[PDB]
Amino acid sequence: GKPVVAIVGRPNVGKSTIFNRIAGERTRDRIYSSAEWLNYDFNLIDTGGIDIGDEPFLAQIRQQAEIAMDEADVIIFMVNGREGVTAADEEVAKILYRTKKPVVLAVNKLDNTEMRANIYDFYSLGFGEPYPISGTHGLGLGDLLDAVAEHF
Ligand SMILES: Nc1nc2c(ncn2[C@@H]2O[C@H](COP(=O)(O)OP(=O)(O)O)[C@@H](O)[C@H]2O)c(=O)[nH]1
Ligand SMILES: [K+]
Ligand SMILES: [K+]
Ligand SMILES: [K+]
Ligand SMILES: [Mg+2]
């Protein structure tokens, strides 16, 4: 698949679980894989699987974001809807402000519709509409991939 979509985010936001829900090729996931979702044919990257080589935590999360800004056509910025906006999320956001490329914000661990309102805190990151998802329950994936593919 021609467009490249990269998932970026701090640890424990659900990146590998979403990669495995979406990816064709079966660390916790294959890192780089073809993917197909209906009419969408693309390559997917879980940048959280890229070992940066003995660097501090914050440097590793910023460097994963930088690799996405280099490699990808569209970035999925993933955050944890049960934890709010953390400083580490703010640090990833500050890196992603440097790109012109489309960033779609995905708020994961929203395990049923009653949790949707947890998205409103994440408008503060400055990437527009947060998309609620659950990788374990398989929720919101079509809506997320439609927003990503709008950019193709
Ligand atoms: N409640 C909940 N837990 C999830 C969800 N997605 C992932 N998890 C769990 O959160 C943990 C971290 O998930 P993982 O995909 O490895 O996150 P990563 O560190 O961002 O790659 C694991 O225990 C997952 O099973 C979700 O949608 N809801
Ligand atoms: K529900
Ligand atoms: K769906
Ligand atoms: K384009
Ligand atoms: Mg992972």
Curated annotation (Swiss-Prot):
Q: Which domain of life is it from?
A: Bacteria
Outline the extent of the EngA-type G domain.
3-152
Annotated residues for binding of GTP 1: 9-16, 46-50, 108-111
Q: Which GO terms describe its molecular function?
A: GTP binding; ribosome binding
Q: Give the phenotype of cells or organisms lacking this gene.
A: Essential for growth, it cannot be disrupted. Depletion experiments show that cells become longer and abnormally curved, with nucleoid condensation. Cells have many fewer 70S ribosomes; the large ribosomal subunit is 45S and is missing proteins L16, L27, L36 and interacts with 2 large non-ribosomal proteins.
- Tell me the Gene Ontology biological-process terms attached to this UniProt entry: ribosome biogenesis
Q: Which UniProt keywords apply?
A: GTP-binding, Nucleotide-binding, Repeat, Ribosome biogenesis
Signal peptide positions are: none
Q: Does the keyword Cytoplasm apply?
A: no
**What is its quaternary makeup?**
Cofractionates with the 70S ribosome; association is stabilized by the non-hydrolyzable GTP analog GMPPNP, and inhibited by GTP or GDP.
Its function?
GTPase that plays an essential role in the late steps of ribosome biogenesis.
**What extra comment accompanies this record?**
Estimated to be present at 7000 copies per cell.
The name under which this protein is listed is: GTPase Der
Q: Which gene encodes it?
A: der
Say which residues of the entire protein are included here.
Answer: 2 to 163 of 436
